Amino acid sequence: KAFDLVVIGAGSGGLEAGWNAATLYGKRVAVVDVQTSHGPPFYAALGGTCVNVGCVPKKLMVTGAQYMDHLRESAGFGWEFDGSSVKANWKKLIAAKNEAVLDINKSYEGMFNDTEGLDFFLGWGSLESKNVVVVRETADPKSAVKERLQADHILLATGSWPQMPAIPGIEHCISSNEAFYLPEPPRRVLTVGGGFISVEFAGIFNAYKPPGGKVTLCYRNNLILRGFDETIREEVTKQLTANGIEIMTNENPAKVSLNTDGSKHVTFESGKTLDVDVVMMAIGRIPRTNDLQLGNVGVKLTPKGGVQVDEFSRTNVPNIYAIGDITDRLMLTPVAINEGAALVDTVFGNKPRKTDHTRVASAVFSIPPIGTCGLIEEVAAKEFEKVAVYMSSFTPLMHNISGSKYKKFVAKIVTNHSDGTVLGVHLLGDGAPEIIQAVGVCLRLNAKISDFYNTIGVHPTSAEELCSMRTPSYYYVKGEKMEKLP
Amino acid sequence: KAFDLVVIGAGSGGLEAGWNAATLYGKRVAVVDVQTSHGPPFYAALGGTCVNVGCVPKKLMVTGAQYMDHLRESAGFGWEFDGSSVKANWKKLIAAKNEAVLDINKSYEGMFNDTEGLDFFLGWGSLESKNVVVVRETADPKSAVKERLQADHILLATGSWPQMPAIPGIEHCISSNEAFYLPEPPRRVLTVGGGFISVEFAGIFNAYKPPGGKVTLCYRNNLILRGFDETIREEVTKQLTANGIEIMTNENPAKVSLNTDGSKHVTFESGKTLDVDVVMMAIGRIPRTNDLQLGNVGVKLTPKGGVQVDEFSRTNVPNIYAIGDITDRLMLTPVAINEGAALVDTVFGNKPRKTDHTRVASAVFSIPPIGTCGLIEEVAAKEFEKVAVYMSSFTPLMHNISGSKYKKFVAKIVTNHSDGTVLGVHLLGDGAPEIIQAVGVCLRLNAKISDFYNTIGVHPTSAEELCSMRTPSYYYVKGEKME
Numbered sequence: 001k002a003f004d005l006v007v008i009g010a011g012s013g014g015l016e017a018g019w020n021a022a023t024l025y026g027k028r029v030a031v032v033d034v035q036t037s038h039g040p041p042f043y044a045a046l047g048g049t050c051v052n053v054g055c056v057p058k059k060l061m062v063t064g065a066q067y068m069d070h071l072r073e074s075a076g077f078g079w080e081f082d083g084s085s086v087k088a089n090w091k092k093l094i095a096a097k098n099e100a101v102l103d104i105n106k107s108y109e110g111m112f113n114d115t116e117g118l119d120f121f122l123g124w125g126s127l128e129s130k131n132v133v134v135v136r137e138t139a140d141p142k143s144a145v146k147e148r149l150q151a152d153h154i155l156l157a158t159g160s161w162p163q164m165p166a167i168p169g170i171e172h173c174i175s176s177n178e179a180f181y182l183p184e185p186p187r188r189v190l191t192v193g194g195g196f197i198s199v200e201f202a203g204i205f206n207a208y209k210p211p212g213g214k215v216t217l218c219y220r221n222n223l224i225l226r227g228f229d230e231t232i233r234e235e236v237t238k239q240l241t242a243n244g245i246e247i248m249t250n251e252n253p254a255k256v257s258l259n260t261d262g263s264k265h266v267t268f269e270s271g272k273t274l275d276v277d278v279v280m281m282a283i284g285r286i287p288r289t290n291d292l293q294l295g296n297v298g299v300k301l302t303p304k305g306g307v308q309v310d311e312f313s314r315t316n317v318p319n320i321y322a323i324g325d326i327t328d329r330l331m332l333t334p335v336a337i338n339e340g341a342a343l344v345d346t347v348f349g350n351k352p353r354k355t356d357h358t359r360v361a362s363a364v365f366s367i368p369p370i371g372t373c374g375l376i377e378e379v380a381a382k383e384f385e386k387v388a389v390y391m392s393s394f395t396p397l398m399h400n401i402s403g404s405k406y407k408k409f410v411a412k413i414v415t416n417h418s419d420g421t422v423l424g425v426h427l428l429g430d431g432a433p434e435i436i437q438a439v440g441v442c443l444r445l446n447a448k449i450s451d452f453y454n455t456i457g458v459h460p461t462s463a464e465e466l467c468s469m470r471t472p473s474y475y476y477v478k479g480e481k482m483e484k485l486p
Numbered sequence: 487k488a489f490d491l492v493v494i495g496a497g498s499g500g501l502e503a504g505w506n507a508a509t510l511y512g513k514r515v516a517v518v519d520v521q522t523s524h525g526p527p528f529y530a531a532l533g534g535t536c537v538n539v540g541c542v543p544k545k546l547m548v549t550g551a552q553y554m555d556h557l558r559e560s561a562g563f564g565w566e567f568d569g570s571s572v573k574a575n576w577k578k579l580i581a582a583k584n585e586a587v588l589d590i591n592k593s594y595e596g597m598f599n600d601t602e603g604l605d606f607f608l609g610w611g612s613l614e615s616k617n618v619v620v621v622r623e624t625a626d627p628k629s630a631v632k633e634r635l636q637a638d639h640i641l642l643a644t645g646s647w648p649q650m651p652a653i654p655g656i657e658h659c660i661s662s663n664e665a666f667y668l669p670e671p672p673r674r675v676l677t678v679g680g681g682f683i684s685v686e687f688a689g690i691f692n693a694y695k696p697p698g699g700k701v702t703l704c705y706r707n708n709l710i711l712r713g714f715d716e717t718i719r720e721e722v723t724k725q726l727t728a729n730g731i732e733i734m735t736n737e738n739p740a741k742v743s744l745n746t747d748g749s750k751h752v753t754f755e756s757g758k759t760l761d762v763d764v765v766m767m768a769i770g771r772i773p774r775t776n777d778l779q780l781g782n783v784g785v786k787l788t789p790k791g792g793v794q795v796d797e798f799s800r801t802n803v804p805n806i807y808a809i810g811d812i813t814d815r816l817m818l819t820p821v822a823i824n825e826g827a828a829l830v831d832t833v834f835g836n837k838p839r840k841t842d843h844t845r846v847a848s849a850v851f852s853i854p855p856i857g858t859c860g861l862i863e864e865v866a867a868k869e870f871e872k873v874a875v876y877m878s879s880f881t882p883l884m885h886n887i888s889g890s891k892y893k894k895f896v897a898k899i900v901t902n903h904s905d906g907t908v909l910g911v912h913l914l915g916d917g918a919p920e921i922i923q924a925v926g927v928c929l930r931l932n933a934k935i936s937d938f939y940n941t942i943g944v945h946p947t948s949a950e951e952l953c954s955m956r957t958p959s960y961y962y963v964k965g966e967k968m969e
């Protein structure tokens with residue numbers, strides 16, 4: 001019942017901290033989660049959101065969806081078959097995803113039993129006091145105590161949860177959680193939101209829709225994928241449109257009613273209507289702090305509801321730390337993992353290390369995908385007197401042959417033009433997520449544009465574009481866009 | 487006609503050098519090549535080997551070959567279609583490739599038309615004297631004189647040429663050159679060689695072969711792809727085999743005869759025999775110096791037949807330079823291009839620059855592909871007291887579902903374990919050529935393994951393997967491997 005470290009949430013950050021503490025520092029660790037394997041009722045489980053209802057199943061389903069483009073694109077390279085026989089079997093996809101996720105769930109169960117001092121507890125973690133976590137049977141604080149855990153150190157790693165707008169008929173809508181378990185592929189679907197989850201799902205549903213199907217993505221503002229490079233945001237919008245997805249910008253559901261056939265009558269704020277079989281809400285995720293009962297020990301939360309932390313993932317309460325999505329910063333698995341690894345190398349390895357939240361490589365598995373690291377030019381331009389933007393945008397030759405002429409590859413390098421330091425790299429096109437990883441390492445090494453252009457290209461690749469750009473396309477000078485420096 | 491620079495060979499290096507000299511340094515530039523567009527009879531042409539009968543068309547054809555895997559792999563993700571309707575139409579591939587290559591040929595044609603101080607001459611360039619290039623009708627130096635070009639400076643940029651073993655029946659075999667123009671896909675094909683061209687073409691032929699077809703690759707040595715990471719060599723061998731390619735190692739053709747139906751009867755040195763429709767020789771490429779009459783000026787060759795150069799691409803004859811494959815250093819388009827730019831900067835810019843032939847990222851467009859940059863462990867182990875290998879090898883999750891469970895991704899980082907400096911990164915699997923590019927930039931910046939594992943992964947990717955390795959898999963200490 002006594003532990004060096006108790007972790008609430010067996011997810012991306014929680015497991016990295018737990019396993020590191022046990023295996024690197026022979027520490028004694030409790031990890032709490034509400035569920036041992038994926039899906040209803042609590043969706044996230046042992047392994048966390050990414051494993052159960054996030055990156056892992058999403059990427060398998062985007063990979064499935066990509067075959068729609070490969071089957072069509074194959075014809076340009078001389079592949080011939082009965083196009084009229086082509087069917088996308090969603091049920092097969094979901095069964096294959098379910099088996100993949102379950103094997104990971106079981107892989108983590110093995111990890112806990114096999115590892116000394118690493119113990120899993122099923123149920124709901126909350127804080128009784130500074131040094132006691134209570135595991136209950138439900139998220140109700142009044143339910144039965146299964147366990148009382150003594151903790152020299154407490155890690156909050158409970159992640160996030162979909163936000164559902166409080167509109168009439170929200171109960172007819174799903175989140176990404178339910179999207180992973182739809183028994184049938186929707187013929188018509190409204191993905192609500194302009195972020196990566198709405199965009200990724202629009203692509204999935206677009207590939208698997210039955211005949212006479214239609215994917216609509218709505219976003220309340222002017223242009224999807226706020227926080228990404230502007231050129232890439234416009235381009236993804238075109239390329240999604242090109243592949244039959246309808247993008248409704250400056251539009252937002254005001255309500256949903258069931259039609260008598262079970263379908264959804266969406267009324268927009270603009271007064272427009274749309275009938276769809278599924279309304280998937282992907283408008284944001286919010287930290288899971290409620291069920292932890294943080295009032296009991298006075299852990300300070302931020303305006304937006306995320307656990308306030310310093311650079312070392314420390315709360316205002318000594319011995320109590322918080323990593324990953326509960327901190328409501330960068331909601332990425334590898335950031336959660338990095339924070340957990342750093343927190344444990346600090347507290348238990350006596351080797352203080354802080355996560356760098358700058359120059360983080362990330363991806364959108366849009367079709368085609370985004371790979372990005374560091375600052376967008378708008379952001380750079382406000383911090384630096386002189387910003388250069390290097391840009392190469394073209395339909396790769398293979399997509400001239402494939403027939404997908406709309407698949408413009410975009411490579412942008414944003415620099416501090418005063419010294420050539422690379423501030424950001426922004427890619428749209430096949431392989432962007434793979435290209436961008438080692439760019440992350442480059443930015444950590446303070447790479448300049450000349451480090452890229454003096455490296456010899458790998459030919460033929462999309463990636464060599466990054467090593468072929470010597471001359472700015474344009475600049476920002478004290479915030480002002482211009483073709484040429486004064 | 488008199489030029490600051492005459493370039494013999496309108497290829498990767500030759501065009502970089504000529505365009506740079508003309509446009510950046512304002513020099514009057516002549517460039518010579520034997521053809522304005524791709525294919526028979528001389529195969530290479532305006533644009534060079536890469537454009538016409540190398541990197542560009544081969545990448546298009548491997549992309550085509552990859553759909554064989556995508557169509558089969560689609561089923562695991564729920565895709566359904568009539569498998570028996572599936573045909574690989576080679577003729578369509580070749581026509582698509584030919585248009586793509588011809589478009590590049592035409593654009594280079596327009597570049598010469600529209601670029602003042604940059605002139606193209608059609609025919610065979612050779613040295614008459616140290617300041618005169620003669621362009622003739624044919625490779626034969628007795629053929630008719632089309633031009634005589636006065637040159638302050640002469641760049642030899644004629645590239646390389648397939649090596650053909652002098653065996654009985656060599657005339658019944660082709661090289662990569664002819665392979666790009668086969669009118670029909672061979673039912674049975676022997677690729678001879680364990681290098682990237684043999685392996686890449688074995689993949690191409692394997693996808694487009696007519697029903698009941700068979701691709702065989704033979705190699706004199708024990709394990710294909712010498713120079714590549716040994717784990718990757720063993721895995722690519724397995725993964726080719728798993729996709730129906732017959733790998734015959736320790737085998738080499740002794741001779742070829744025509745069977746009565748006109749197929750090729752192959753006699754291997756081991757006595758063994760194989761009947762194939764095509765024998766593609768991919769055993770090496772040799773510098774193209776024969777036709778240049780370098781004897782007229784005394785440019786020093788190696789016994790190989792490459793032009794000897796210093797680090798600045800200077801021959802023993804002042805004002806005569808060589809870059810690209812003709813120099814037999816690193817036979818890659820981007821190296822040729824880099825050498826060309828570096829030469830012109832040195833000579834016409836007084837900006838002294840030499841190509842770094844170390845830590846050059848390269849790829850093999852095998853199925854699945856290889857991306858590599860820097861030293862393999864065996865090499866690092868002879869030059870460094872302590873070498874660490876970080877290795878991650880596994881079937882990606884998507885290939886459990888696809889049914890291609892043989893498709894092991896391999897990521898390996900080789901370090902100087904004394905300071906953690908990355909010496910080499912070696913990748914096998916989907917994306918590897920795309921992943922390795924920015925790794926080339928890392929190695930230029932003296933990246934250490936700690937720079938990799940302190941970088942935050944992009945997830946889910948194959949590339950994040952590079953940023954998730956904390957702990958060596960094994961070591962070499964004074965050349966000896968220690969788990």
Ligand SMILES: Cc1cc2nc3c(=O)[nH]c(=O)nc-3n(C[C@H](O)[C@H](O)[C@H](O)COP(=O)(O)OP(=O)(O)OC[C@H]3O[C@@H](n4cnc5c(N)ncnc54)[C@H](O)[C@@H]3O)c2cc1C
Pocket residue numbers: 008009010011012013014032033034035042044045046047048049050051053054055056058123124125126157158159160176197288291292323324325326330331332333334336945946
């Ligand atoms: C659809 C989708 C796609 C995504 N795609 C990507 C992607 O491609 N790449 C990427 O990097 N990130 C992606 N993410 C984000 C990623 O899933 C999260 O950033 C990551 O899971 C956060 O990890 P964490 O450690 O904060 O918590 P999680 O991994 O969310 O783990 C939290 C765990 O805590 C448990 N829990 C919660 N409350 C309690 C309690 N009171 N007691 C006990 N257990 C509790 C939950 O059951 C859960 O298992 C995606 C997210 C979603 C929703």
Ligand SMILES: Cc1cc2nc3c(=O)[nH]c(=O)nc-3n(C[C@H](O)[C@H](O)[C@H](O)COP(=O)(O)OP(=O)(O)OC[C@H]3O[C@@H](n4cnc5c(N)ncnc54)[C@H](O)[C@@H]3O)c2cc1C
Pocket residue numbers: 459460494495496497498499500518519520521528530531532533534535536537539540541542544609610611612643644645646662683774777778809810811812816817818819820822
């Ligand atoms: C099948 C194959 C695949 C390849 N794949 C890749 C790859 O994926 N990536 C990569 O980086 N490299 C690849 N390469 C290598 C790449 O093609 C070469 O390294 C590169 O083309 C060499 O450039 P260069 O300037 O030295 O010569 P080249 O580009 O070969 O140009 C030489 C030119 O000179 C002309 N010429 C020859 N003799 C004369 C003469 N006497 N007078 C006039 N003109 C003459 C030829 O017609 C030719 O156009 C491949 C090569 C082959 C054969």
Ligand SMILES: CC(C)N1CCN(C(=O)c2cccs2)CC1
Pocket residue numbers: 392394395396397464465468
């Ligand atoms: C390697 C680098 C030079 N890029 C090759 C691919 N690429 C194109 O497709 C185009 C060629 C000309 C106009 S667009 C952009 C440039």
Ligand SMILES: CC(C)N1CCN(C(=O)c2cccs2)CC1
Pocket residue numbers: 878880881882883950951954
């Ligand atoms: C980034 C790092 C954690 N890797 C994740 C992917 N990966 C696997 O999928 C494995 C499957 C089989 C054995 S491991 C290897 C490890």
Ligand SMILES: [Br-]
Pocket residue numbers: 707708709712
């Ligand atoms: Br060998």
Ligand SMILES: [Mg+2]
Pocket residue numbers: 111112113114115116117118119
């Ligand atoms: Mg245990």
Ligand SMILES: [Mg+2]
Pocket residue numbers: 597598599600601602603604605606
């Ligand atoms: Mg001209």
